[PDB]
Design an enzyme around this catalytic site. Structure first.
Site, short mmCIF file in Angstrom:
data_model
loop_
_atom_site.label_atom_id
_atom_site.label_comp_id
_atom_site.label_asym_id
_atom_site.label_seq_id
_atom_site.Cartn_x
_atom_site.Cartn_y
_atom_site.Cartn_z
N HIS A 156 106.27 19.21 54.61
CA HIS A 156 107.53 18.65 54.99
C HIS A 156 108.80 18.73 53.90
CE1 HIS A 156 107.56 14.62 53.15
NE2 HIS A 156 106.44 14.35 53.81
N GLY A 186 109.97 8.83 47.81
CA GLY A 186 109.46 9.73 46.49
C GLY A 186 108.14 9.76 46.17
N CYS A 196 105.65 10.73 48.17
CA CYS A 196 105.24 11.68 49.03
C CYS A 196 104.64 12.63 48.18
CB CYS A 196 105.95 12.48 50.16
SG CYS A 196 106.42 11.27 51.42
#
Ligand SMILES: O=C(Cc1cccc(Cl)c1)Nn1nnc2ccccc21
Ligand SMILES: [Cl-]
EC number: 3.4.19.12
Lengths: 305, 292
Positions: free
Chosen positions: B41, B134, B136
């Site tokens: 993503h 942040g 991820c």
């Protein structure tokens, strides 16, 4: 979202852990630059522990009596000195993995990460707090002496604790990295007991502000309190007195959530009176006191839910 | 003595964390050998990926910029081939875990590790983590001997504040998808074999007020347990608890009768290992490892 007991990444400390052997005793040491720091009781036998004269035991030792192992490499000891309850072993090699560091002495209520080690090998990392009675509720077994406590705010490691012993209640006592014990404890096998423990009030308040930041307000009430009235109630539940310094330190969290410190104090008084009634706060059924105001600001979002 | 929620030492994983930027999105990547793994993503994923070139992906390892020389997708993970092999690559394996198993999470922001915590894969396939925007690309792992077993990569947060992610091969844990749509965690259950292991740890540490003279059958225990949203206890779970049963002298079904009484009557103002709730995020192996 979420709120976990979070420890600092331990890598900068792992690269400093060494094994120190003196006679039949084996424990951990902290290798920083060309010096290995470890508890001075490494020079003792179990008999010596009753009334050890460390100056007399140390004078009989030479450099080659101390065996220091860093991974699979043997370090050569070229000097030795005692500073309070810490032994400093000068070695011939500087640790190439030495991080940026400071030795800091903490106050009760402060939190830190512990890297638990056995035979100079790290086995686990956990977060804990210096209790008001100067002990720590750690998780240590025989061979863990010399394991260290630290904080890593920014890129600098602040060493604040070195493990020395387990008291009869299962709690732990140790020193700062200059060898001064936290509390009225001594590195001696004598009748020593931790004083009655209390709850760290400023930390419980910080944790209630963290719950409000994460969207929970069920415990709030329409009341406020004076600082003195709060302390009279708190002391009946074995809570530490809340000082004006604590109120000042909670200022930023009070401004962020819109709840005055003495209004949050009134919610705490009510929680102590009523309990949780089957509810939880941040997944806990007890009031949590091992998160400081600084830990809450670091972990939680700057935007209240 | 003592019993803490303990994570594995994170150093071997810290040396793999990098920052990955694509356009306006910045998240974390795992640098192993000459490949950087991160959530896809960051960029119809094939249609979006075909429009990207190697230089569109900015990878930063500390203060050094890595050069992306290739890119490919594997399920919900993007693999960025880089020109430099990570000299800090530890011995590793990619492993997929089962619900009830625990692991350490190294939470990161901008390719910089900020904290380490221990957690468990819930029966509903979510994790109760602690993450902000942040995070991820942050990873979950275990260490067995000197080998790091990577088992989780963080992808998203669900509306209840719980977290969802994939194994390192990009397969999600749970019925989730990597996109903004209506997704929700299923009704969760308590990990029974882990609660029992934690009761054995309490006995080992001298907390025995909950022990009783009674025993139960496995079937009667499961009829009781399902009533309290507890996961069923299997014969495999009983076998796995064998060593702790031999160490403390309390048969597994004997400990089940204690658990049955704790569920029906509560704790009555008492705590177990400093907790007023029954703890289910320590496996039988975590208990043996921490108490050895
Ligand atoms: O307590 C000692 C030795 C000792 C005895 C008396 C005084 C001093 Cl300074 C040191 N070692 N430790 N440390 N943590 C432990 C946890 C469990 C078992 C033993 C443990
Ligand atoms: Cl302090």
């Amino acid at each position: 979202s979420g709120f976990r007991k979070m420890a600092f990444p331990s890598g900068k400390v792992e690269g400093c852990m060494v094994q120190v052997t003196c006679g039949t005793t084996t424990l951990n040491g902290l290798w920083l630059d060309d010096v290995v720091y470890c508890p001075r009781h490494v020079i003792c036998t179990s008999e010596d522990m009753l009334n050890p004269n460390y100056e007399d035991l140390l004078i009989r030792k030479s450099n080659h009596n101390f065996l220091v192992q860093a991974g699979n490499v043997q370090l050569r000891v070229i000097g030795h000195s005692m500073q309070n309850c810490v032994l400093k072993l000068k070695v011939d090699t500087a640790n190439p993995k030495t991080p940026k560091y400071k030795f800091v002495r903490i106050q009760p209520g402060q939190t830190f990460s512990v890297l638990a080690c056995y035979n100079g090998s790290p086995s686990g990392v956990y977060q804990c707090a210096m209790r008001p009675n100067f002990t720590i509720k750690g998780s240590f077994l025989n061979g863990s002496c010399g394991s260290v406590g630290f904080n890593i705010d920014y890129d600098c490691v602040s060493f604040c604790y070195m493990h020395h012993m387990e008291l009869p209640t299962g709690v732990h006592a140790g020193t700062d990295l200059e060898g001064n014990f936290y509390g009225p404890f001594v590195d001696r096998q004598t009748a020593q007991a931790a004083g009655t423990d209390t709850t760290i009030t400023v930390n419980v308040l910080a944790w209630l502000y963290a719950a409000v930041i994460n969207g929970d307000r069920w415990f709030l009430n329409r009341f406020t309190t004076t600082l003195n009235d709060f302390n009279l109630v708190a002391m009946k539940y074995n809570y530490e007195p809340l000082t004006q310094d604590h109120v000042d330190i909670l200022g930023p969290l009070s401004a962020q959530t819109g709840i005055a410190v003495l209004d949050m104090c009134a919610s705490l008084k009510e929680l102590l009176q009523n309990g949780m009634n089957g509810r939880t706060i941040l997944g806990s059924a007890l009031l949590e006191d091992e998160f400081t105001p600084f830990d809450v600001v670091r972990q939680c979002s700057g935007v209240t839910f």
